[PDB]
């Protein structure tokens, strides 16, 4: 799927994310069940108020996971097995809740990476996220 | 659709500080850009092969408000979103033959388009907001398809 | 909806020949073998770890008529397709939190059961028939969303 | 995407389909001309009724192509190389194409093989058929 220039843009972009992929990804959380509540149904466990701890504490590993991606995107379906399992084999998750995910991430970073979130920018992280979402379904087709 | 009522009050006033013009077009700059399959529908717009071309694109700009422009009239129109669409969804089936789960994209990325432009004023909650009315048109959009 | 009137009566002789129960049970066994995610909103029904395990288990099958019976209804009811699934558009939205696109994956793997049930009396277009049916029908579904 | 069952069980069952890919490929084509004529669309220079010799020739090149891959599992963005260009990038085909042809293939599938579609072949064929069309818009992500 990923071109050079994807590669390249992704890494690019992602420098610029810093370390606040933690709250990138938690914010992306947040967004996600009020815009999509069909979502909650999977956290159940989890309190879902309005900075929860937990979501804090999910968006740092979910902002981890993407960090780790964005370093093994040649080899991604290696670098996502544990993880491919997890939300494929054990949590079933629809995988039409990825694509919202992965929105709801790219409406974060524009929120704070008005200017860094060319277009350009948006179409390689649309596809890296595509990817990523493949691969954390693969374990499915 | 319905929504509520405070929800109801805080989509207008933003739409009041939304720049149709700025905003459309980097709508449909993004759509071709981000889902170029799109391309194929605009091809009239000659030039589409990279971003810059794209964004620079003045028939694209146009089109963009017109669209934006449209959608604007949704948001003022809540109550009857089919009643308002059905002669664009006439337009979009018959004629032109775009997937639904194109408008739907569109939606989405209009919508990204307003975070970037409003920064930390886009809240989650407002985000939900729009996320159903971009729905709800997305929908009337797809209803007097046959 | 509406399709045409030879369309309609082709539709109905061939429900005619389709047996409820094996078909019913066929459709919701690969739903849930070819989309695995499926399962989640049946766990209650216990062992799908295999296909085997599947197909035989006998609250699938049950359940299976069930659906395959709504969706009876739906054939025999085209003219009010959204009028009939408004207390089951319900159902599903409310308390089970479907994704409609669900509807819409099952929808055809009907179909595809009903292909390889019918043989080559499943013509071209009376496939298409049936696309439209269950096109009709997983959009009464998704309609009394909200 | 594909597990070692996924590779062996698309293999078998396209043993099974034999020489007859060309047709099942184009009765493929006529049902999603029929059923999804959004589609028609794309072949606006060719004979669409009710067995154009066009859609004849061209059915025996998709079976072929598709057979091709089973050849090359292992290797399918190599293989389909060619071809990913002419969807993506000269015809731009959306998509959600892919999906209704996959569709209408597995339909045709089952018309014919209605004792070896068994659900197991099914799902394989599914993620064969979806793994394929990635690779045919990845030329996009
Ligand atoms: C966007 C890509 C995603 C990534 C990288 C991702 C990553 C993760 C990670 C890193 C964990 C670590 C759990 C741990 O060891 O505590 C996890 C667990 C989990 N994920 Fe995701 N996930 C993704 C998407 C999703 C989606 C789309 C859903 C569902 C809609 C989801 C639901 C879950 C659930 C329900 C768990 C169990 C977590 C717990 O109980 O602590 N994730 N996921
Ligand atoms: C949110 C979904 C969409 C909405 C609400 C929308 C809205 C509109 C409107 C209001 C018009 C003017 C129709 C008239 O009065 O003649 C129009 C025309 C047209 N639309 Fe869209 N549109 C949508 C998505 C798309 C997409 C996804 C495409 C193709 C990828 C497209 C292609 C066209 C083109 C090229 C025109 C110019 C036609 C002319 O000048 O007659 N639209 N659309
Ligand atoms: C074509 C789309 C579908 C239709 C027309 C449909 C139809 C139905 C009907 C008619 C009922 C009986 C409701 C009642 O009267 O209590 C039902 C209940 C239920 N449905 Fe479906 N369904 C569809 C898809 C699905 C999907 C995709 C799932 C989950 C993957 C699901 C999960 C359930 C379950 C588990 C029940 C048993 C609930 C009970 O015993 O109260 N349905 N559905
Ligand atoms: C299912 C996977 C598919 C395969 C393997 C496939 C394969 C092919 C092949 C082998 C050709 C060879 C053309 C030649 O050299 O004459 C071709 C061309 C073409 N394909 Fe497909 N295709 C696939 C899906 C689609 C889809 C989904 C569409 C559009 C909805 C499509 C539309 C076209 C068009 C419009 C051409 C130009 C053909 C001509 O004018 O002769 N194909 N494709």
Same mark, same amino acid.
């Given at each position: 799927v990923l071109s050079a220039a994807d590669k390249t843009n992704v890494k690019a972009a992602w420098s610029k994310v *810093? *370390?606040?992929?933690?709250?990138? @990804? =938690?914010? =992306?959380?947040? $967004?996600? /069940?009020? *815009?999509?509540?069909?979502?909650?149904?999977?956290?159940?466990? /989890?309190?879902?108020?309005? @900075?929860?701890?937990?979501?804090?504490?999910? *968006?740092?590993?979910? @902002?981890?996971?993407?960090?780790?991606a964005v370093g093994h995107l040649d080899?991604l379906? @290696?670098?996502?097995?544990?993880?491919?399992?997890?939300?494929?084999?054990?949590?079933?998750?629809?995988?039409?809740? /990825?694509?919202?995910?992965?929105?709801?991430?790219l409406?974060?970073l524009?929120?704070?990476?008005?200017?860094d979130f060319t277009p350009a920018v948006h179409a390689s992280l649309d596809k890296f996220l595509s990817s990523v979402?493949?691969?954390?379904?693969?374990?499915? $087709? | 659709?319905?929504?509520?009522?405070?929800?109801?009050?805080?989509?207008?006033? %933003?739409?009041?500080?939304?720049?149709? +013009?700025?905003?459309?077009? +980097?709508?449909?700059?993004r759509?071709l850009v981000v889902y170029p399959? &799109?391309?194929?529908?605009?091809?009239?717009? #000659?030039?589409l092969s990279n971003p810059g071309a794209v964004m620079?694109?003045?028939?694209?700009?146009?089109? #963009?408000?017109?669209? %934006?422009?449209?959608?604007?009239? #949704?948001?003022?129109?809540?109550?009857? %979103?089919?009643? &308002?669409?059905?002669?664009?969804?006439?337009?979009?089936?018959?004629?032109?033959?775009?997937?639904? +789960?194109?408008?739907?994209?569109? #939606?989405?990325?209009?919508?990204?388009?307003?975070?970037?432009?409003?920064?930390?004023?886009? &809240?989650?909650?407002?985000?939900?907001?729009?996320?159903?009315?971009?729905?709800?048109?997305?929908?009337?959009?797809?209803?007097?398809?046959?």
């Amino acid at each position: 799927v990923l071109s050079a220039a994807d590669k390249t843009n992704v890494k690019a972009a992602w420098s610029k994310v *810093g *370390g606040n992929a933690g709250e990138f @990804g =938690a914010e =992306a959380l947040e $967004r996600m /069940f009020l *815009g999509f509540p069909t979502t909650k149904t999977y956290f159940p466990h /989890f309190d879902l108020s309005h @900075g929860s701890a937990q979501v804090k504490a999910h *968006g740092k590993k979910v @902002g981890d996971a993407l960090t780790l991606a964005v370093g093994h995107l040649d080899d991604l379906p @290696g670098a996502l097995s544990n993880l491919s399992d997890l939300h494929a084999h054990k949590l079933r998750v629809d995988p039409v809740n /990825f694509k919202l995910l992965s929105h709801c991430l790219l409406s974060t970073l524009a929120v704070h990476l008005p200017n860094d979130f060319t277009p350009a920018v948006h179409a390689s992280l649309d596809k890296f996220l595509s990817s990523v979402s493949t691969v954390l379904t693969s374990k499915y $087709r | 659709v319905q929504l509520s009522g405070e929800e109801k009050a805080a989509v207008l006033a %933003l739409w009041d500080k939304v720049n149709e +013009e700025e905003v459309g077009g +980097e709508a449909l700059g993004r759509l071709l850009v981000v889902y170029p399959w &799109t391309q194929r529908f605009f091809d009239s717009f #000659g030039d589409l092969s990279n971003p810059g071309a794209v964004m620079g694109n003045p028939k694209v700009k146009a089109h #963009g408000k017109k669209v %934006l422009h449209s959608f604007g009239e #949704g948001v003022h129109h809540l109550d009857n %979103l089919k009643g &308002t669409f059905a002669a664009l969804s006439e337009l979009h089936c018959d004629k032109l033959h775009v997937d639904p +789960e194109n408008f739907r994209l569109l #939606g989405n990325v209009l919508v990204v388009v307003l975070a970037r432009h409003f920064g930390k004023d886009f &809240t989650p909650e407002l985000q939900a907001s729009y996320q159903k009315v971009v729905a709800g048109v997305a929908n009337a959009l797809a209803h007097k398809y046959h």
